[PDB]
Design an enzyme around this catalytic site. Structure first.
Site, PDB file in Angstrom:
ATOM      1  N   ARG A  44      52.827  90.288  42.962  1.00 38.85           N
ATOM      2  CA  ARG A  44      52.887  88.897  42.447  1.00 38.85           C
ATOM      3  C   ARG A  44      51.765  88.726  41.423  1.00 38.85           C
ATOM      4  O   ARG A  44      52.055  88.412  40.233  1.00 38.85           O
ATOM      5  CB  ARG A  44      52.770  87.910  43.612  1.00 38.85           C
ATOM      6  N   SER A  47      46.975  79.738  53.139  1.00 41.71           N
ATOM      7  CA  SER A  47      48.374  79.264  53.277  1.00 41.71           C
ATOM      8  C   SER A  47      48.642  78.939  54.740  1.00 41.71           C
ATOM      9  O   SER A  47      49.587  79.507  55.317  1.00 41.71           O
ATOM     10  CB  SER A  47      49.352  80.303  52.793  1.00 41.71           C
ATOM     11  N   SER A 107      55.099  78.527  50.318  1.00 36.27           N
ATOM     12  CA  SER A 107      53.688  78.083  50.326  1.00 36.27           C
ATOM     13  C   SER A 107      53.317  77.417  48.984  1.00 36.27           C
ATOM     14  O   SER A 107      52.296  76.709  48.975  1.00 36.27           O
ATOM     15  CB  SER A 107      52.728  79.178  50.700  1.00 36.27           C
ATOM     16  N   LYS A 137      52.611  73.689  49.076  1.00 40.88           N
ATOM     17  CA  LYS A 137      51.284  73.178  49.500  1.00 40.88           C
ATOM     18  C   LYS A 137      50.616  72.381  48.387  1.00 40.88           C
ATOM     19  O   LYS A 137      49.761  71.553  48.672  1.00 40.88           O
ATOM     20  CB  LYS A 137      50.435  74.305  50.067  1.00 40.88           C
TER      21      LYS A 137
HETATM   22  C1  LIG Z   1      53.600  80.836  52.187  1.00 39.14           C
HETATM   23  O1  LIG Z   1      54.332  81.242  51.320  1.00 39.14           O
HETATM   24  C2  LIG Z   1      53.228  81.450  53.517  1.00 39.14           C
HETATM   25  C3  LIG Z   1      52.290  82.662  53.359  1.00 39.14           C
HETATM   26  C4  LIG Z   1      51.686  83.079  54.661  1.00 39.14           C
HETATM   27  O2  LIG Z   1      52.941  83.823  52.847  1.00 39.14           O
HETATM   28  C5  LIG Z   1      54.553  81.597  54.259  1.00 39.14           C
HETATM   29  C6  LIG Z   1      54.492  81.760  55.755  1.00 39.14           C
HETATM   30  C7  LIG Z   1      55.905  81.336  56.127  1.00 39.14           C
HETATM   31  S1  LIG Z   1      56.057  80.686  57.862  1.00 39.14           S
HETATM   32  C8  LIG Z   1      55.397  82.090  58.789  1.00 39.14           C
HETATM   33  C9  LIG Z   1      56.075  83.363  58.379  1.00 39.14           C
HETATM   34  N1  LIG Z   1      55.190  84.526  58.582  1.00 39.14           N
HETATM   35  C10 LIG Z   1      54.639  84.712  59.722  1.00 39.14           C
HETATM   36  N2  LIG Z   1      53.992  85.845  59.977  1.00 39.14           N
HETATM   37  C11 LIG Z   1      56.214  80.346  55.035  1.00 39.14           C
HETATM   38  C12 LIG Z   1      57.515  79.599  54.935  1.00 39.14           C
HETATM   39  O3  LIG Z   1      58.381  79.961  55.692  1.00 39.14           O
HETATM   40  O4  LIG Z   1      57.708  78.817  54.037  1.00 39.14           O
HETATM   41  N3  LIG Z   1      55.327  80.340  54.116  1.00 39.14           N
HETATM   42 BR   LIG Z   2      51.805  83.262  50.119  1.00 40.83          BR
END
Ligand SMILES: *C(=O)[C@H]([C@@H](C)O)[C@H]1C[C@@H](SCC/N=C/N)C(C(=O)O)=N1
Ligand SMILES: [Br-]
Ligand SMILES: *C(=O)[C@H]([C@@H](C)O)[C@H]1C[C@@H](SCC/N=C\N)C(C(=O)O)=N1
Ligand SMILES: [Br-]
Ligand SMILES: [Br-]
Ligand SMILES: [Br-]
Ligand SMILES: [Br-]
Lengths: 236, 235
Positions: free
Chosen positions: A221, A96, A48, A51
């Site tokens: 974190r 996110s 994330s 982003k």
């Molecule tokens: C960014 O770091 C995001 C945040 C929600 O923690 C994550 C989400 C995943 S995809 C969905 C996984 N979780 C679902 N319940 C993601 C990625 O895989 O890069 N970023």
């Molecule tokens: Br995150």
């Protein structure tokens, strides 16, 4: 430039039975500090944290008109409640919201995404989640310093809007502009926090990652980064 | 007896890729501080820190007449150079001369050694590879009795051992202390126990740390001093 290992910060990780790195950069003094010079320079999936550049590119190309444009929920229910609603850039970044960013990436296209990441000197679709893109803590700091000074090749406007969207925390003592990350698709599973602390007289850039075997530890974190910022007297 | 955990001192251990505990006791305020309440209360072999009570018992029974009496080298060369010479109580304590302390123990005898350690409330070759065990907080409790001349032995015995514990002094502080290195039984640990005398106060201390090799022995003193510096007990 010049880096210093401060193994004393390892106490903040071990206190929580955790492993990772915190990297700080004092902008005024042009000096960096980390608990682990090696891990500071190990590249992981941005997750994330991607982003930030995704937002910049989407804005600069007009895929996102401004921070108010509404991205309608596609109606598909997902396991993160906050995703199951309409979003703008501000709330998409805060929560996110992957689906919104996937749509940005499709409209950007791999050719324009590639030229932009090369122009940003960013690290080396879904590529930021389970693909080839990798970035270290120190590479995060190097990118964030360009964003802070509006030195990325995109419009000043694009950079101001993304910095607004990065707003996380503010009071009379400090402002934090940052982005959380959680990489799970490829080992090792890590949490990220990258951004900076704006003070009256200085900016402290930071990039931390840590082993995140389960969801339970995500709060560490922020908590571990703040313990380091407290110790270094950057915030109360 | 109130104790407070100060996890910030763990920085002093991790800075040296080391694990252990420091325990401080502020005598004026009757408060203790440690980086690790659990390890503070874990009992280990006393090793050369046992020379404190051994010295006290030897003096009180007249096995050692005074700090000047000479213990003649037995002529057997040992791998620690400083042991291969005559000693008195002062140099035997300073150089941790085991053969001299073994001779004290033989002349004390197990019956009198036992009654004395019970009277000292001390912990639970026996101090090297036997059953005697003591924690950091138990070390502090014993050292505070020695400091105040409250152990059941003569005041004289207690003054002489405190003299023999002298390690460091200047215009800022006096340290009276005893080093230890336990290697016969796991885990291999280093000790430093004693106190810091200031103009207006006394700070008791007991530290132990994992000592897998000889290389780290200096960290006993160096880590304790980093904690004493941080707490502004010494410059
Ligand atoms: C960014 O770091 C995001 C945040 C929600 O923690 C994550 C989400 C995943 S995809 C969905 C996984 N979780 C679902 N319940 C993601 C990625 O895989 O890069 N970023
Ligand atoms: Br995150
Ligand atoms: C005290 O801790 C001693 C110092 C020198 O580090 C340490 C030495 C060992 S070996 C005993 C010598 N054996 C025959 N002369 C020791 C102990 O075993 O308790 N203490
Ligand atoms: Br703002
Ligand atoms: Br006397
Ligand atoms: Br003296
Ligand atoms: Br020793």
């Amino acid at each position: 430039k010049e880096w210093q290992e401060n193994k004393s910060w390892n106490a903040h990780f071990t206190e929580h039975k955790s492993q990772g790195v915190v990297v700080l950069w004092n902008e005024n003094k042009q000096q960096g500090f980390t608990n682990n010079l090696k891990r500071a320079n190990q590249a992981f999936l941005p997750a994330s944290t991607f982003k930030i550049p995704n937002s910049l590119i989407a804005l600069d190309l007009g895929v996102v008109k401004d921070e108010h444009q509404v991205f309608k929920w596609d109606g598909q229910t997902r396991d993160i409640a906050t995703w199951n609603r309409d979003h703008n850039l501000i709330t998409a970044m805060k929560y996110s919201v992957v689906p919104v960013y996937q749509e940005f990436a499709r409209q950007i296209g791999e050719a324009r995404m590639s030229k932009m990441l090369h122009a940003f000197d960013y690290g080396n679709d879904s590529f930021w989640l389970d693909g080839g893109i990798r970035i270290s803590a120190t590479e995060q700091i190097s990118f964030l310093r360009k964003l802070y000074h509006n030195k990325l090749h995109v419009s000043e406007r694009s950079q101001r809007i993304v910095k607004q969207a990065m707003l996380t925390e503010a009071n009379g003592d400090y402002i934090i502009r940052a982005k959380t990350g959680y990489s799970t698709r490829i080992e090792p599973k890590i949490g990220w926090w990258v951004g900076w602390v704006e003070l009256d007289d200085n900016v402290w850039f930071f990039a931390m990652n840590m082993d995140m075997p389960t969801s339970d530890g995500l709060g560490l974190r922020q908590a571990i980064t703040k313990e380091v910022l407290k110790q270094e007297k950057i915030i109360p």
